[PDB]
Amino acid sequence: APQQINDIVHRTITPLIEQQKIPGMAVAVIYQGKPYYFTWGYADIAKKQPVTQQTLFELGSVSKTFTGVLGGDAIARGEIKLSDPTTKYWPELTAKQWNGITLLHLATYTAGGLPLQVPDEVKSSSDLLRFYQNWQPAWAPGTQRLYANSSIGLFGALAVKPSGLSFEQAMKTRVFQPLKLNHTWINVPSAEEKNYAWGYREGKAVHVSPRALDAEAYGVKSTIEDMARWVQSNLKPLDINEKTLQQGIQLAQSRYWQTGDMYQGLGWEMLDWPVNPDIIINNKIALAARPVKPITPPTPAVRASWVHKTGATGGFGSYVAFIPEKELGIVMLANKNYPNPARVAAAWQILNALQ
Numbered sequence: 001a002p003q004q005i006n007d008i009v010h011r012t013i014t015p016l017i018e019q020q021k022i023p024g025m026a027v028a029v030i031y032q033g034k035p036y037y038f039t040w041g042y043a044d045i046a047k048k049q050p051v052t053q054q055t056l057f058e059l060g061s062v063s064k065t066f067t068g069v070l071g072g073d074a075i076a077r078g079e080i081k082l083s084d085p086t087t088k089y090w091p092e093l094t095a096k097q098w099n100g101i102t103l104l105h106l107a108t109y110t111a112g113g114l115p116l117q118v119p120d121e122v123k124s125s126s127d128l129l130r131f132y133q134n135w136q137p138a139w140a141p142g143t144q145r146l147y148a149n150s151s152i153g154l155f156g157a158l159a160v161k162p163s164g165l166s167f168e169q170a171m172k173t174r175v176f177q178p179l180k181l182n183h184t185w186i187n188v189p190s191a192e193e194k195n196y197a198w199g200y201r202e203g204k205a206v207h208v209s210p211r212a213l214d215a216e217a218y219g220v221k222s223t224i225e226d227m228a229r230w231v232q233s234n235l236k237p238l239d240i241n242e243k244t245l246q247q248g249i250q251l252a253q254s255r256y257w258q259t260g261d262m263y264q265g266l267g268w269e270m271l272d273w274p275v276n277p278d279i280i281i282n283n284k285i286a287l288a289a290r291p292v293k294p295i296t297p298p299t300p301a302v303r304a305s306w307v308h309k310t311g312a313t314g315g316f317g318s319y320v321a322f323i324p325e326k327e328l329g330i331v332m333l334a335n336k337n338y339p340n341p342a343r344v345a346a347a348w349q350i351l352n353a354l355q
């Protein structure tokens, strides 16, 4: 790879792997819009199967960026509007407490304290309905941000209703296929399983467990190559020829809410660049209930931004960040869930060196 990339990746990631005992890792650096790939370690420890450019990793919450873009594409298609009440798409939620909860609120975790997880016992649509009906809001809609799978998971499920497609089928047809993500899956086909890394959690070989709204919240598995393509697509939305998808990507990177120095997009989270790295390395906002300021109209994607998302499942840790104005980005995929500050510090060190 270009030597500037060689040196910073080597000096940054090699220590990280050793420090965190990561079994296998893949990194892509997008530099002047072009991808460069790096791989370390093992997709299967026992069988000493190396991580490759074809290795599939669980993206965890980075999947929410796909959900946000799919939602954006639906808005651009005129199928849904973010101001639409939830009850338009699920009339059975009609109640005073669901008054004024809109798709926007679901997409951006501002519905008023929807739970962090959908309960393990929820398996049927009837179970799901009871869960959302019985929920007791902590706050008025559009006042507090509380990051939650039950919020964006519902958004994803409702956003696709007017399409007449399942969530998986919509994602495939409207996002994966046009962007040429041919090794990105919600459900890994049996013949592709050969590429699926084991995750490792405290020594156990594990894969993500099925759960309600999993596809919408943390469902995606992908390769380092496809993730690089995802970053390229998000860096340069104008390059995408399918108009609604182009528009959808731009809508997902718009700033709908602000808290402290941080902004909420659809799936994507953002800050103005340059950032103070302490506040994203030691992020005190992301996982806390924080008051938010609405931005109306939402600020179109700002080019001088740090746009990012972190993800984890039981056995995997992922991170994506990019800076549109610099044509620069990074994807880090690992088959161990390791702490967020170490991921973010590594990504910032690399991008800061290349900017």
Ligand code: NA
Pocket: 097, 132, 133, 134, 135, 136, 137
């Ligand atoms: Na209730």
